[PDB]
Design a protein around this ligand. Sequence first.
Ligand SMILES: [Zn+2]
Ligand SMILES: [Zn+2]
Lengths: 710, 114, 49, 137, 181, 138, 48
Amino acid sequence: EITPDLWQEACWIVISSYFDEKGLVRQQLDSFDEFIQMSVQRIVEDAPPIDLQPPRYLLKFEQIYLSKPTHWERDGAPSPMMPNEARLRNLTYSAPLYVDITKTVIKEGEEQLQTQHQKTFIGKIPIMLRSTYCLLNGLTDRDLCELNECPLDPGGYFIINGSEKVLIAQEKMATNTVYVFAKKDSKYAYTGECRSCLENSSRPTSTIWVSMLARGGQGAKKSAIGQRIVATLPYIKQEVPIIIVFRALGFVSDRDILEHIIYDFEDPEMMEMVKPSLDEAFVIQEQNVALNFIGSRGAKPGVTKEKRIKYAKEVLQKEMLPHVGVSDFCETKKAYFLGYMVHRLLLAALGRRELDDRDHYGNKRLDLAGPLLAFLFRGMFKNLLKEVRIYAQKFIDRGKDFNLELAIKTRIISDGLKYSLATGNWGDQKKAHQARAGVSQVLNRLTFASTLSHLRRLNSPIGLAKPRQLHNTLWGMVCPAETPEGHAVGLVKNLALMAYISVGSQPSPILEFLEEWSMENLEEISPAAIADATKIFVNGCWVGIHKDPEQLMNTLRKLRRQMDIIVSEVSMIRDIREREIRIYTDAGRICRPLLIVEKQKLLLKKRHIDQLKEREYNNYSWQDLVASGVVEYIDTLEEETVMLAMTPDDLQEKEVAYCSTYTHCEIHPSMILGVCASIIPFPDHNQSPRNTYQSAMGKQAMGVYITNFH
Amino acid sequence: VGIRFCQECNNMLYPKEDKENRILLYACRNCDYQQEADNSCIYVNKITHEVDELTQIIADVSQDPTLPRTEDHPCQKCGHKEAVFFQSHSARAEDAMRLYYVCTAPHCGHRWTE
Amino acid sequence: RTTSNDIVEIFTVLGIEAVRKALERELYHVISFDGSYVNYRHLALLCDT
Amino acid sequence: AERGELDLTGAKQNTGVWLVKVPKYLSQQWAKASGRGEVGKLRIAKTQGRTEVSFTLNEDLANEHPFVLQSVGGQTLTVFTESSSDKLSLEGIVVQRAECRPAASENYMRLKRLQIEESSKPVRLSQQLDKVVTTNY
Amino acid sequence: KNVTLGVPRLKELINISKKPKTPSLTVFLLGQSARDAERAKDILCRLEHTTLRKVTANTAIYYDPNPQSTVVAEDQEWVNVYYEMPDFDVARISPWLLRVELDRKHMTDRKLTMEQIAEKINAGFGDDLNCIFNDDNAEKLVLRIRIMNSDKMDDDVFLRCIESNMLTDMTLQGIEQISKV
Amino acid sequence: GPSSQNVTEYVVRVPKNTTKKYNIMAFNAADKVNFATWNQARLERDLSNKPEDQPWLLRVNGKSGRKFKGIKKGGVTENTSYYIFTQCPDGAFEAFPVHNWYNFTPLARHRTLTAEEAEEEWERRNKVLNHFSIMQQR
Amino acid sequence: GSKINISQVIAVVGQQNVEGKRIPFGFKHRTLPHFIKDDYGPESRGFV
Ligand SMILES: [Zn+2]
Ligand SMILES: [Zn+2]
């Protein structure tokens, strides 16, 4: 039925199940697993075919193949590497990377004899222990002990040259999310940041800025002109107004431009606020002239006006908000998204909304080992393709033949990955100036607590006190007491114990379901109906509007709670004050479990507690607990619009009326503490500075750091 | 008061007067379309913004789980003796903390302040 | 008895000696606000030099 | 009379057409039907102050699809035609917008899940080799 | 109210910063005003910088080529009471009208009068802008503004420019760069 | 009467193939499109690129009438298939897939500033005098 | 030590403030998910 005054046992049993199923380092393990399983295949597949010529030569890559880690001894005999041997001999723990090259030849004589170079070696990918592609996976206690590897070791680290290196998650501004900021001193009054990128596969982040000119030069007609709106497009040296850009997208009718910018035509205040841009753009009236204008101010001005037109079209096509679409005919989506962008800017201008806080961890994500290795592999693969292209051109200008076996240089990927993972200069070796440092620190091994704390660690890119202060967002999300005492205090933080980082998934099934579920796509839509309906976002990109918000919310939540086609890791938002439904699926989000609450009672009933208490020989665990729709993954974004209960028996039971619509209930309040801060007894009774100091020491508290020390 | 565009040229219109008949004749400047000004008003500006937020509070905020809920202050059109309250939270609109109430019936939504 | 907290303003209005006296007073105020006391010799030397 | 000229006879006739969206499973049901000639029965029910539109699947095709009308005043829809003889013509102007939804409330997500593994059937992922491949060089 | 102190203050003092972070200025009243609270309030009003924004409530622009048009509903009274003597009306009156209201609460709080506000307005701009005088008997203390007669840029643009100029830096009362006292 | 409880049942037919492809033209309802003025129409592919992969162009009554430019839907309808129901004497509804979505927006006809001279009024970046007066000079 | 420390140990820790003001509204006009929206009570703004 229910769990009255038995809550201690129930909560600690469910936490037992959670830690027995997942563990402590699953963020690293799952990130790397997803990287190896999908990111490498996506990166290699989504690469430009190599075309060169006379006969035409085309090369296309194919499925990735991986094998267990091996050592290429001097005699050349393959030998399964072992983590112990890797540590002792200063041998990098890695496995070869194999691909299939399809060499298709065209001699302009129907001589297409395609040859498939199956299993072509291209480099060595470092492999991190206890991963599904490591050699320790699945071994029980007996084999691990027999193999001279500690059973208690959480793994989650690489081995380069015998030094155990561990990747540290890095914070960055969340991609594909329009922000608004108010620079205090800058010539722009308010500005809008929408750092955006495609689905973590094609090109790094490209930023679009939109801003408002501050009131200046008064006394003259400048005040009569008023505040003008300006945006600095990517790959454009200087700034440019907005309506000119909108006309560059191909929409000339000022009625249509205001329809895009404005959803309700009964707001004279905002009409007057946007009028200055209309007056400014009264000299540009056609698409071609606007394209010439924007292209004329690029880094390399075109030789002829057709050259400026082509450059402007290219930059507005590929480098302009890639996440919304780069499929040529997607100009309407770009136009609508820019309209929403400037609409949010105007709403910030009029004070109807409020400026988004930069240091709000619901507005930034964590680059885990997966995405970081994906970025490095992207760079190294581009370098390898360039090397192959130049080698092929040089060797075929003679015109004799071509050989892929010798053309491909496995040296480049292996050394690039090894170097970047070893010394921490994250990027190409020659470009250390622009390469972010501090990544892949040496694993700390003074104590088991130290090792776990180092595995579960974040880091900010900052070298002012605002970024380095604790924030409300970090409740149960990052350890509050823990932080380094030194100069890096605040920037470096450890995850909460129950915290779980989003490995990531694709948005295809969500878009399919939404499109089927009586949602109007954002092309065959009447513009006038936008205001009265609710917007929809999937990883930022606007995809349509819906007129039944709560029904859609209930359906999506029901699907998530059952692991239907929508993945459990996904979260969905509803800001009713703004009429939006934000759905996020990209990796890098951070999340924690919570208990669902319906009506006023927990869905966690005595039967679930009994089953979990009998977890052994019952094939019932945390995943099966989530199967019954009892515990729900609520990330920081979704925490923004829910209500939590500290303890059911204290809050859920009726009392003097304070709240009666608790949507979720905490697993246990103590879970907010981190690894090193958890061992503190009675941390509440202590003063927080001394909790912090002790949390620093727990790394330095010596002991039996690992069982197999000898 | 508002803004009008063409009838046949889909373009925005400025104000103008008639030199002969002395009447405000909204005339297209990009084209040659004109009409008489029934409103006879050209410009309005409420800098201090007396306009209360009630004109733009959305009704569906009532079914937001996270807002408070108060039993008193029943709705007018329907009794429905339980509703929600929340501050303006609108910078520069007004410096008055007057609580805004909205009824929480499935089809109601009559809003009021007191 | 009217004075100010700005230094350049009082310099341009009154004179360098006024800067001396006002800056000494203001430094004494800011140092002595939290209760810690310092001797007049050092403040006088800094303001003079 | 010119090749680039567009026929306007349909518009002059005030022809009215309806735009309707249908789910993927039903669309592939029609595709499997291959235009046999009869594919289903559409039912329209009008009350004293309400109208009901529903679509019934053919029993042979399977071995209810209620329709929700949409406002058409927000935009004007017209259908033209590009004939194989290069003679563009305008069929008419859309007069009503209709949407199709499934009757299933929970079981339909099973079909959605199946379609999801079908779509994720060709998504490619790396494979693990038990033994190192020694067929290179 | 408080003034910054401590490490940033010491930095700002050891440097000779051309802008203070929190500039402040203590004043002592000389004679009877020192003890008289009413006189202290009078000096407060005399020193506090009061721009047109802080006292005006709403602004409007209208088109009234005939002074007897009286487009506003309740403007006939003072309009007629002022226009019986046609001050250079025949020459030109710039049909573009500018209408503003001064909120009574701010009027009473800052203890200034609208007649001397109009005096300052017409004195600062001289005779290149005609002003209209209204009485306090009306529920709304309306103030009508028109353009000179003896004269590119049209007239509405110029009228809006003058509106913004008067709004930002008319300097109705007080001494500039004194935000609050 | 019968309308108070009228019930209608029509057939649904889907021909396997049509000799003439079926597409759609969409106008903004705010555009205020009037088909009475549709005395003559020409629809031709654009020449800006200089075929099937290029935007369409529409002209109304020659140069005298308004002008529309066609745009193909950038998105793909992998999960959707829009059909048009046309009334016929037999009473059997016929559902036809729509090949492409061709949106058209009006093209203004007037003296339009060109970029070569457009650089001239950029020196009047913010000092552009009498915005109304700019168009008469051309 | 000081008498304020004795008060904190014995009676009441006292108001906790950041940058002078009380706990800022990091979330949508609330300090943590556990408190009802738009609350300025002592328990819900930092007081211990
Ligand atoms: Zn026109
Ligand atoms: Zn009600």
